[PDB]
């Protein structure tokens, strides 16, 4: 049961599927009944009930293997708790761009930028794959 | 209560006074310079020579007066002032890599050859020669010290390491002189650059190197060394050499191969 | 001159519970206090000379 | 130039930059491939209950693991150093032209024939003409004759600029008191820009570079112009 | 009764299978990778300058008003 | 005993997700920024001389 | 004559030397003639390799030193 | 000698919890702000 | 309080104020950084022209660098654990080791100062002439930060010094240099690295001290002297600077990845020790891949472009290392492994575009580009910076005796994971295609990617904040730790959490067998 | 002469280190202990001057990998990887 | 200098195997690469009867007294310039 | 690692205050600077 | 050495009838940390050494570890529980699942 911070120097119980007999036993101290049990163990576990050879498991370890192993729903709240403070990150390029950003450059208007599209286009602006060559100059149009 | 050999120094104020004394000086230059004014600068090297008088007596009371300086202990502190050692070294290094690229690629402005056109350099023979032969004398010097002090013998000991600072003493005083007479200076373009920048960072390793050989030369004659236990001693005998070493190199590049 | 190494052992050596930099004896204490005096008036003074330069003149 | 959204490098315009292009690809696929071995090495690792933690010996597959990249950095090496002193060869240029960066613009200079010299300076965004580029734009751009081979000549009069023009691979530092070569090879007429490629001070952002590639007859009727 | 199935070496061989299958995957990408960027680089820029005319670009050019230096 | 995540796994998951996705799409169509995708496909080119 | 040759002297990317030479030549070159009095024309190629490599700052801050006794190369 | 153990291998107190939320978020909060009060003192210069 | 924290002699006591010191420094370099995506997430200008703009990318750098991540690693995480890790009971060289620590704070309050005078160091954190120079930066601004690094300078000197004699010196005497952990012997390499790069740098920026203040001209062409000089004598330092960086880094992940693998010791350990030793060396003969658009002879290029990417080797090996022992291991999903599993990925992809960068002829196209931003943040903002969070969440409960809620720091992780990528990854698409470093502004074509990264940026800021709550919640709740897994081959824990102010006051008991 | 000696004038630790040595003891622990055989019957001996002290088993020649555990006063403990036998001798100095 | 290595820690065998194998035989290893690639013959210059080079004050006391030691036909002419 | 229960908890509702004092700290201060912009640049 | 010769050296490790805990602890968290599942026969000797060590629960945790060190392969633990069926029996030792021990 009670383990205590001034017993680290001293062998520990750990649950590790890697380790699987620990160093000590999981309860050390026994009641007349679990001494009684002890007692019992030395002649044939044959004898022994279903509930008796649990009971000397559950003395010798804490959890069992399949206790142990045992997968949780920690994923979620992980997952979950990301998306949600990522999400309040959007909060806070929405205030930016109110409070902050004033306006962008006349640059980005729709009219400067269809006239500086087709100065692009007219001075051949990347035109083996990057940028022209993406506009069919017999048609007059994007390349379909 | 301990069972290594190894040395838990008591709490100490000088860490933290040495620290402030380096903010003070760093600060008292950029005032002295663009603020024209030396308080801070004055304050700060106050200060930096009261922590470093502090630490080291300290250090001493604790191996002369204390016997912390177990031979673990004093191992560690033979490392220490190599390493202390070969991080000059690099110092200089970096001086020394600026003279090479100056003087090996002269550019048009000094006329394109070195030593640049309207420099008139020292005459090496003259007394940087002289110079020369008196910090390799005071490596003799120091030498005999060490082994006088080695043999247990006092008044040799504290004759060859008087020798010894009055010849560093006398390097200065040449030095200084030769500064003085001069032709060029060091807004001479790079070749006073290079020429008082190296020479004078070597300069103010004598003038340390010199005195730490006083503070042995102190402690000698107060007996605190014994004839196998004198590290102070040993390591002002390293940096010793290291500054003679830093000479003969600058003597060769700047004075020699530079004229 | 003599050696008075010994005495300065004993001095130092003293079970007085006293931190090495200050087991002089009151010359220490003082020393310690000038010391500590200049470092920190002049950390404030810094600190003043850097409110001063942060604006034009 | 760049367009929106761009992910790999401005087209090329001399060769030497095409043979950037595809030593680059050639690299890059090695890029992934590492990268995508390790993240996947890394999952498989990673994938399993069995367990083997016992000492394990490193007395081989060490080997592997350092001939391996050995043999990748050489067929790396090989093609980088072939592009290397491929833009070191001789070449005998037509031409000369000198660029000198100032705190905030180049002045050009050519001086082969007659005394031939210009600042030129970014259009202030305010001042752009319609379907102008915003901070790339000059008053005065760098007229050249195409499919020749030039001779830049690269200095500065104040602080480092670099003198940069990514479509013709090319970028060089500007430093006073130094002259630094570059050879310059267009293969096409065109509009082609670069920015000042080294910190400078305060509008460092704002003293672009505008090469006009054209016919040599126009370009010797532009230089007499200018004088 | 069951069969006796494998018991021994189980990682190392989940690890063998593995890396064969992570090299044949690779090899398979670079054939990918140098079929689907790096050729159709070189094709693009092949097919480019196969015919391609400087003057004539340079007189669309000119003519749709671009240069400082040609009207 | 069900621990912190049998009993808000699930809503903390959902509700995080619907919110982010919320947020997000909203701070990117909708308060003004400027993507500047490309013209390719999207831009009817005009005449600029 | 178009541009300033390769140099096989100066065959790597600082170039600086080469300005400075030709610009040294050409005053040296000048200065022989000149006093032996005679044909500075013959001097043509030097001027034309420096004043296509070298930026015009150099030479016109040159020239003024040689008019003011402190050009610090030999000429 | 000195206080040894958790809590007490440290130059702060974490007696309470709420006095230590004030004394951390003055103390990251100060680095924090830092740099956008000197981007307005620089500002607030020419 | 004031004998124990402002006069310590203590090893960790003095790695905790180095710990602290370091955090504070962190949230600067954030702000800072959070200022430069600020400016950059939409075209047009925000906070001014070049000058303020580039004061702000300076500091980010000298701090996030000098304050941050030296201080964590070397002065932090350094004195905390090498002592205990081979059983000492401090470091050789207690007081001067306090005086290290002690000369930080000055050379930030240095470096505060340059930010506030006249109109600050815009200069980039190599800090070149004549930039930098008396004409272009008149005033006390460069002085203050030449000064800032000198103190600095001085602090690792002195640090890498007592490194690197308690390492060699102080060890149980049956303990070989081929017995110490990989973390040791990554402190030991980084300070030989430092106590040899350090006073070159130092002999430079005095250099350009005396250049703008004593009329010398090393740097400066009127006297002779060569700009491109101080860079040589800069980069000399500086790329060394790179490694004792990451190196520390190297030797946590080292120690992680062995500890959540459930494993007794890492793959190949001599290969290890190898390794770093081998990355140390090439480290000082490369420095010229800083300067390949300066215009330096070919065969020269060829030279700098060989050597540096020889370094892929031996660092392919620990990469190699790592996963080989990760192979078979009951693997621990904490969230220290976390952070370690995404390093490896992150510093491999980084060092990578290294090796893309080390190829002078494609350089020429990206040097002074985002391409190169990109490559550096990788290997920092996720190399250096993962392992230093995977250090931190694995040795908190050794420092403080409490637990972190491992929910929290997982999410945290998470946050941070997606921030980084989004900041950095868009980079590689600016530099490819142009955009140059040290930019308040930018052509139009580069909003995109630019916008997108500064979204980024924000999201690692909330990653920042959340990593604050958490340290708070931590000491807040107060669980304090009982068992700890694996002690037989991870001696700092061996004494408890926390361990005692003094420990090996009896040492270890060693056999020669 | 003139000089002191160590014999004359170390003191402190120095001194008791200087003394003990010449005595062929080892009471701080500069010198490297040798194994016994660490059988059962035949334990190294590790001196302590508590009931416990940490012990490093370098348990093959050569191995990098050190085994650290707490040595209590009492029965013989073995090295959780090799088995070797160590046994605590308490108390003194 | 230090170099970049470190250890120190104790002068052994073990020390010196592991930089003979860990440095210096990668360091021949690498150098030997360099020159298994820089090899390969070179375009021998034209011959001009310099009269420094080619000396000849007394037959050499081997072959027809006028080839030189370890005289290489390809590279080295004889005072009337190559053979073939 | 294993660990002893918290010796003092903190709830939900103390974690949200403790996280939302924290983010705060850092977003106020920054806030009212860059708020305040214009009038400090765009004078 | 062969695989038979491994098997031989576990077979005898835990055969030793003066086994002691700390010996049988030693042998099982060491041979778990291989690449393998233990043979039928070291088990065998495992469990025997459990009794003579009247330790009960250790023969469980080791049938545990058995079917651990399968990972996925499902078919191997049957197979060994197969095969230890008459051992099993003969002392009295039930399998994890039989005590329910098997359940999160
Ligand atoms: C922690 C920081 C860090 C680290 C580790 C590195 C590591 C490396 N760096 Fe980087 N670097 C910086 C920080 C760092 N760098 C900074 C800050 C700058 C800019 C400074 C400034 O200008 O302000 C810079 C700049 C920089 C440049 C300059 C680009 C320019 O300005 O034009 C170059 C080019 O040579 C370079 C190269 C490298 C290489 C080859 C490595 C290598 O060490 C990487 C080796 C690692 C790997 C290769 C991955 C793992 C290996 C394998 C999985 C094996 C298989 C791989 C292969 C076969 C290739 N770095
Ligand atoms: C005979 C030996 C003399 C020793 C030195 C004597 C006086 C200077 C004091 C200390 C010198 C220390 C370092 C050297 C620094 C600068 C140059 C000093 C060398 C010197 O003394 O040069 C003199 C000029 O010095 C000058 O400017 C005077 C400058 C005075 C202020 C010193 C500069 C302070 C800045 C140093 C920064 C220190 C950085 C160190 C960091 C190390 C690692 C952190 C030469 O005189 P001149 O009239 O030009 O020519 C002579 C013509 N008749
Ligand atoms: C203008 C006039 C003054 C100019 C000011 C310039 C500064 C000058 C400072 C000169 C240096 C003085 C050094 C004094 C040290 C005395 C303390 C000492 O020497 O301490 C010794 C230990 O070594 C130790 O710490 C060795 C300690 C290392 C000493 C380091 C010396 C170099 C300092 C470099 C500072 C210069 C900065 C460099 C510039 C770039 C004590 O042990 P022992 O000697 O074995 O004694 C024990 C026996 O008695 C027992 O039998
Ligand atoms: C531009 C202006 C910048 C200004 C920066 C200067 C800042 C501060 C200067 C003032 C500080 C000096 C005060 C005295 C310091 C003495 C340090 C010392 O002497 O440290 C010794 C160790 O270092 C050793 O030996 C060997 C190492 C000794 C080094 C001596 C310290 C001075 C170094 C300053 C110069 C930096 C180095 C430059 C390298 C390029 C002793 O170690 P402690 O832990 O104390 O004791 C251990 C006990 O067992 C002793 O019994
Ligand atoms: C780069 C890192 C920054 C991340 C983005 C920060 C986003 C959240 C910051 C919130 O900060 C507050 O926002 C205000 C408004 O929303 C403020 O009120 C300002 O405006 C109020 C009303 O509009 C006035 O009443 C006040 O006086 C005040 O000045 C301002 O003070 C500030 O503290
Ligand atoms: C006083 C002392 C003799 C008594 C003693 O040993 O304590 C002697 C021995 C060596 C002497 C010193 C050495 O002879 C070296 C110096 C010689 C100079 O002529 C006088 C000062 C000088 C520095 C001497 C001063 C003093 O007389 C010393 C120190
Ligand atoms: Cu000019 Cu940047
Ligand atoms: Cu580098
Ligand atoms: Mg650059
Ligand atoms: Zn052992």
């Known amino acids: 049961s009670v383990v205590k911070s001034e017993d680290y120097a001293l062998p520990s119980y750990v649950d590790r599927r890697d380790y699987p007999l620990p160093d000590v036993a999981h309860v050390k101290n026994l009641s007349a009944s679990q001494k009684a049990l002890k007692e019992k163990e030395k002649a044939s576990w044959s004898s022994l009930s279903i509930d008796e050879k649990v009971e000397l498991y559950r003395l010798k370890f804490k959890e069992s293997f399949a206790e142990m192993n045992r997968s949780t729903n920690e994923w979620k709240t992980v997952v979950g708790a990301a998306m949600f403070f990522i999400g309040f990150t959007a909060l806070l390029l929405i205030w930016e761009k109110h409070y ?37 100059y017999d048609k007059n149009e994007w390349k379909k | 209560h301990q069972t290594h050999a190894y040395h838990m120094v008591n709490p100490s104020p000088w860490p933290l006074t040495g620290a402030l004394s380096a903010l003070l000086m760093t600060s008292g230059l950029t005032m002295w310079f663009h603020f024209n004014s030396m308080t801070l600068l004055m304050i700060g090297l106050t200060t930096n020579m009261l922590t470093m008088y502090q630490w080291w007596r300290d250090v001493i009371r604790e191996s002369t007066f204390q016997g912390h300086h177990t031979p673990a202990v004093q191992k560690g502190l033979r490392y220490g002032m190599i390493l202390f050692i070969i991080s000059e070294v690099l110092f200089f290094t970096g001086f020394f890599w600026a003279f090479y690229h100056s003087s090996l690629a002269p550019t048009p402005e000094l006329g394109g050859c070195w030593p640049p056109t309207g420099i008139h350099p020292l005459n090496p023979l003259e007394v940087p020669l002289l110079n020369t032969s008196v910090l390799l004398a005071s490596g003799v010097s120091i030498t005999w010290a060490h082994h006088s002090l080695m043999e247990g013998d006092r008044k040799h000991m504290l004759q060859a390491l008087f020798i010894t600072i009055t010849l560093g003493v ?90 | 001159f003599e050696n008075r190494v010994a005495e300065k052992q004993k001095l130092f050596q003293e079970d007085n519970g006293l931190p090495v930099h200050l087991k002089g004896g009151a010359t220490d204490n003082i020393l310690y206090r000038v010391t500590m005096t200049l470092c920190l008036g002049g950390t404030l003074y810094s600190l003043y000379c850097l409110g001063w330069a942060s604006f034009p003149h | ?147 020749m081979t030039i001779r830049m000549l690269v200095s500065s009069e104040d602080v480092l600029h670099s003198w940069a023009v990514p479509s013709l691979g090319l970028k060089t530092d500007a430093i006073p008191g130094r002259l630094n070569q570059t050879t310059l090879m267009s293969s096409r007429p065109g509009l082609y820009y670069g920015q000042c490629s080294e910190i400078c001070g305060s509008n460092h952002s704002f003293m672009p570079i505008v090469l006009e590639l054209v016919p040599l007859k126009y370009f010797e009727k532009w230089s007499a112009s200018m004088l | 009764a069951l069969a006796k199935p494998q018991m021994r070496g189980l990682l190392a061989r989940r690890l063998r299978f593995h890396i064969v299958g992570a090299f044949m995957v690779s090899l398979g990408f670079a054939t990918f990778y140098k079929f689907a960027v790096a050729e159709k680089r070189k094709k693009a820029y092949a097919d480019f300058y196969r015919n391609y005319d400087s003057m004539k670009d340079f007189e669309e050019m000119r003519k749709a008003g671009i240069f400082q230096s040609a009207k | 005993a069900p621990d912190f995540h049998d009993k808000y796994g699930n809503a903390v998951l959902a509700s995080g997700a619907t919110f982010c996705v919320a947020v997000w799409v909203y701070m990117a169509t909708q308060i003004g920024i400027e993507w500047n995708p490309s013209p390719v496909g999207r831009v009817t080119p005009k005449e600029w001389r | 004559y178009q541009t300033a040759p390769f140099d096989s002297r100066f065959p790597n990317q600082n170039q600086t030397r080469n300005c400075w030479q030709n610009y040294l030549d050409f005053h040296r070159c000048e200065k022989a003639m000149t006093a032996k009095g005679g044909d500075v024309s013959v001097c043509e190629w030097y001027r034309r390799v420096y004043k296509s490599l070298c930026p015009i700052s150099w030479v016109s801050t040159w020239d003024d030193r040689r008019a003011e006794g402190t050009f610090p190369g030999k000429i | 000698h000195y206080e040894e153990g958790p809590g007490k291998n440290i130059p702060f107190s974490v007696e309470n919890k709420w006095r230590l939320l004030a004394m951390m978020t003055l103390f990251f909060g100060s680095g924090f702000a830092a740099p956008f009060f000197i981007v307005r003192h620089q500002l607030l210069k020419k | ?108 309050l240095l470096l505060l100062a340059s930010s506030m005078v006249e109109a600050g160091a815009g200069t980039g954190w190599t800090v ?83 250049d703008r203040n004593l009329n010398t001209t090393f740097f400066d062409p009127a006297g002779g002297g060569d700009p491109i000089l101080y860079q040589h004598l800069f980069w000399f330092f500086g790329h060394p600077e790179v490694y004792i960086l990451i190196l520390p880094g190297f030797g946590m992940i080292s120690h992680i990845v062995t500890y959540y693998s459930g494993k007794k010791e890492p793959f190949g350990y001599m290969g290890m020790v190898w390794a770093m030793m081998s990355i140390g060396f090439l480290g000082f003969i490369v420095w010229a891949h800083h300067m390949f658009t300066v215009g330096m002879d070919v065969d020269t ?53 290294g090796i893309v960068l080390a190829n002078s002829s494609l350089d020429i196209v990206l040097h002074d580009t985002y391409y190169v931003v990109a490559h550096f943040h990788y290997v920092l903002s996720m190399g250096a910076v993962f392992a230093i969070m995977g250090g931190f969440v694995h040795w908190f409960p050794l420092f403080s005796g409490y637990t972190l809620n491992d929910t929290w720091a997982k999410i945290h992780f998470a946050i941070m994971f997606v921030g980084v990528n989004m900041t950095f990854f868009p980079q590689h698409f600016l530099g490819l295609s142009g955009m140059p470093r040290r930019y308040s502004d930018y052509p139009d074509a580069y909003t995109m990617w630019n916008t997108i990264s500064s979204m980024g940026s924000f999201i690692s800021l909330t990653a920042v904040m959340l990593m ?46 | 002469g003139g000089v002191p000696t160590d014999e004359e004038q170390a003191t402190g630790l120095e001194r008791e280190v200087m003394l003990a040595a010449r005595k062929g003891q080892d009471p701080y622990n500069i010198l490297a202990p040798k194994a016994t055989s660490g059988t059962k019957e035949d334990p190294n001996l590790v001196p302590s001057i508590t009931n416990k002290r940490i012990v490093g088993c370098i348990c093959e020649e050569d191995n990098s990998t050190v085994i650290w555990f707490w040595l209590h006063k009492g029965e013989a403990q073995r090295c959780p990887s090799c088995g070797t036998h160590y046994k605590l001798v308490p108390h003194q100095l | 200098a230090s170099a970049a290595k470190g250890d120190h820690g104790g002068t052994g065998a073990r020390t010196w195997r592991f930089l003979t194998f860990g440095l210096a035989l990668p360091s021949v290893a690498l150098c030997t690469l360099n020159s298994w690639l820089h090899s390969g013959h070179r375009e021998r210059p034209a011959f001009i009867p310099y009269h420094h080079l080619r000396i000849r004050t007394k037959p050499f006391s081997w072959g027809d007294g006028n080839h030189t030691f370890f005289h290489n036909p390809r590279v080295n002419p004889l005072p009337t310039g190559y053979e073939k | 690692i294993t660990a002893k229960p918290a010796k003092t908890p903190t709830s939900p509702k103390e974690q949200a205050i403790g996280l939302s004092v924290t983010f705060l700290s850092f977003l106020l201060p920054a806030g009212w600077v860059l708020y305040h912009l214009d009038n400090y640049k765009k004078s | 050495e062969t695989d038979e010769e491994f098997d031989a050296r576990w077979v005898t490790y835990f055969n030793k009838p003066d086994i002691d805990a700390w010996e049988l602890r030693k042998g099982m968290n060491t041979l778990v940390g291989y690449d393998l599942v233990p043979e039928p026969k070291i088990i065998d000797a495992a469990l025997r050494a459990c009794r003579r060590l009247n330790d009960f629960a250790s023969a469980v945790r080791i049938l545990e570890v058995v079917k651990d060190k399968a990972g996925p392969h499902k078919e191997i633990y049957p197979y060994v529980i197969q095969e230890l069926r008459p051992t099993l029996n003969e002392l009295g030792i039930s399998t994890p699942e039989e005590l329910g021990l098997d359940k999160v």
């Not at chain 2, 107060?222 to 003679?244: I, L, M, P, Q, R």
């Not at chain 4, 007659?114 to 965004?125: A, G, N, V």
């Not at chain 9, 710990?19 to 200022?35: C, H, K, P, R, Y």
């Not at chain 9, 890498?160 to 049956?174: D, E, G, S, V, Y």
């Open chain 1, 100 to 136: 902050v950003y004033g306006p962008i450059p006349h640059t980005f208007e729709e009219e400067w930028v269809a006239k500086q599209t087709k100065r692009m286009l007219d001075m051949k602006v990347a035109p083996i794959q990057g940028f022209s060559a993406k506009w069919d």
């Open chain 2, 170 to 259: 006398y390097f200065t005083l040449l030095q200084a002189s030769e500064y003085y007479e001069a032709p060029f200076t060091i807004s001479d373009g790079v070749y006073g650059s290079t020429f008082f920048v190296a020479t004078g960072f070597h300069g103010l390793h004598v003038i340390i190197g010199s005195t730490f050989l006083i503070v042995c030369f102190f402690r000698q004659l107060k007996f605190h060394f014994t004839s196998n236990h004198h590290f102070g001693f040993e390591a002002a005998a390293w940096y010793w050499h290291f500054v003679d070493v830093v000479w003969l190199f600058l003597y060769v590049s700047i004075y020699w191969w530079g004229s």
């Open chain 4, 1 to 147: 130039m760049a367009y929106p959204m761009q992910l790999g490098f401005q087209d090329a315009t001399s060769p030497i930059m095409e043979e950037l292009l595809h030593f680059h690809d050639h690299t890059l696929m090695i890029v992934f491939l590492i990268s995508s071995l390790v993240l996947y090495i890394i999952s498989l690792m990673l994938t399993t209950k069995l367990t083997h933690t016992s000492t394990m010996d490193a007395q081989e597959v060490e080997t592997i693991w350092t001939i391996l990249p050995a043999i990748i950095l050489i067929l790396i090496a090989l093609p980088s150093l072939r592009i290397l002193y491929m833009m070191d060869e001789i070449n005998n240029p037509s031409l000369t032209v000198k660029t000198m960066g100032h705190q905030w613009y180049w002045s050009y200079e050519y001086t082969d024939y007659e005394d031939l010299s210009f600042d030129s300076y970014m259009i202030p965004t305010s001042e752009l003409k319609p379907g102008e580029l915003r901070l790339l734009e000059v008053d005065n751009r760098v007229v050249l004759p195409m499919e």
């Open chain 9, 1 to 108: 309080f004031i004998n124990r924290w402002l006069f310590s002699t203590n090893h960790k006591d003095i790695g905790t104020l180095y710990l602290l010191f370091g955090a504070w420094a962190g949230m600067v370099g954030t702000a800072l950084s959070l200022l430069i995506r600020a400016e950059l997430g939409q075209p047009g200008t925000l906070l001014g022209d070049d000058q303020i703009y580039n004061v702000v990318v300076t500091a980010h750098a000298f701090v996030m660098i000098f304050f941050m991540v030296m201080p964590i690693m070397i002065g932090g995480f350094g004195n905390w654990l090498v002592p205990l890790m081979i059983g000492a009971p401090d470091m050789a060289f207690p007081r001067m080791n306090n005086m290290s620590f002690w000369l930080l704070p000055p050379s930030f």
């Open chain 9, 128 to 210: 070149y002439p004549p930039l930098a120079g008396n004409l272009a930066h008149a005033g006390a601004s460069v002085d203050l930060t030449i000064f800032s690094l000198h103190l600095a300078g001085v602090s690792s000197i002195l640090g890498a010094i007592n490194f690197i004699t308690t390492i060699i010196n102080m060890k149980p005497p049956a303990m070989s240099q081929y017995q110490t952990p990989l973390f040791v012997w990554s402190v030991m390499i980084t300070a030989v690295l430092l106590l040899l790069s350090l006073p070159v740098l130092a002999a430079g920026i005095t250099m350009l001290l005396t």
């Open chain 9, 301 to 353: 290029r060829a030279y700098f472009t060989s050597a540096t990417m020889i370094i892929a080797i031996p660092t392919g090996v620990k990469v190699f290392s790592w996963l080989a022992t990760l192979h078979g291991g009951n693997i621990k999903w904490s969230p220290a492994m976390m952070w370690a599993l995404g390093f490896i990925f992150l510093f491999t992809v980084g060092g990578l575009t």
């Open chain 9, 468 to 513: 604050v709550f958490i340290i708070w919640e931590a000491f807040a709740s107060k669980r304090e730790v009982l068992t700890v897994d694996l002690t037989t081959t991870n001696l700092e824990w061996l004494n408890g959490c926390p361990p005692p102010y003094h420990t090996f006051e009896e040492p270890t008991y060693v056999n020669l067998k």
